[PDB]
């Protein structure tokens, strides 16, 4: 292997595509600067209008221009295969839509680096997010997780790539990648690492054709525990250890490891657990966790990278004196979707929550009010660092499917904090408890007359929220009335400086009884993505 990438290199890109019978060609040109991990490319659809969104093609349309730091040069397969080049193949699975299969040759032709690609797409929905042009033209980013494939003399890569849908929600594209060298000469076969990639999409004002301008940065990295503080490694362990007992069990690992990506089978999970549990005692201690972080490269970058932790401490008490169910220990699995009503002019959040109860092995009263689609009202008054605001919401809850849908409006103008920081504050009564767990649903048992739900939320390296809510029925409407006080926030921090992404991760909320207050309590870590 040799470095023809020491300076600036001219790039050509040619793609021929067919997605659901819709043919198209793309031609691009630009420059690559590997020493700074930089590309600049202008891409043109030569066949008129592109039948798919430009952001779906970014990854298909030259990773040999990655910046490999000096301590990682021995892991750069891409450059080592030059000038003869490599074959890059992918299958890209769009969530709830079709897939692309791609085959590219990336090689030198003279002193120009050329990417020649054929792409075939199938099973797309003609008015899906892809063929219906429903994605935003923003920016994409992600980590490309590389492992050696010694059998083919090359590498594999996987990564989930997110792209914003026009309604503010997120489209997932699951990438499976292979690279093999075109020639016979030696190549570097790397230890597990990843490419940290940020893509900037824009337009030329002077270009009439359907096109994309791309500025892109690609940097090689490898997670090492030596490069994180005790604090950070402890935080990361605690994401896994969500029952707070100091050790990671199999159920926990299964739950949390699947938040690092969508591409692990039940067997892959069993394997990682077995490999990490080096003393075979059925649990991952902290020393074992530290090895597991280096061996399974996605863990720290996906759970902790670019994340703002919010530590929640919660307590729920019945308003009534009627008897309630106090549960054995268990947890709630939360998935959340954030979107925008395109006809609401005020600052607002549409929130969809999926919530199921789990974590009791296998071996009513105010249930009934939830049989039952139930209308919800939400009222919050807030004060964060002296900044007052009110939120008013309405929607529906469906406990039989663990589903709720809410539209929330800031009635005082512009919300002085990001909507995602209020998601947890703005209805655990709409969780679906399995039939073997119905005796553990405190939340429904307190209805009709309801419960108080208090929290303290600690934003790491920033201020905290304190909340008090009453959740009760008034007639046939379920009402959540909340006061929120926030203090000690930094005016240029991630909260008051609005540097949190408009999306939401999945979480497991461990619930325990609090018999002395005749209720339940819970503490859990929320993970807000930064930017
Ligand atoms: Ca544990
Ligand atoms: Ca162990």
Author numbering: 5 to 65, 69 to 370, 385 to 447, 451 to 555
From the paper:
The recently developed FRET-based calcium sensor Twitch-2B uses a minimal calcium-binding moiety derived from the C-terminal globular domain of toadfish Troponin C (TnC) fused between the mCerulean3 donor and a circular permutation of the yellow fluorescent protein Venus (cpVenuscd), which acts as the acceptor. Large-scale diversification and screening, predominantly of the residues linking the minimal calcium-binding domain and the fluorescent proteins, has been used to optimize FRET changes in this indicator. Here, we report the high-resolution x-ray structure of the fluorescent proteins mCerulean3 and cpVenus within the biosensor Twitch-2B, as they undergo FRET and characterize the dynamics of this biosensor with B02-dependent paramagnetic nuclear magnetic resonance at 900 MHz and 1.1 GHz. We find that interdomain dynamics limits the FRET effect and show that a rigidification of the sensor further enhances FRET.
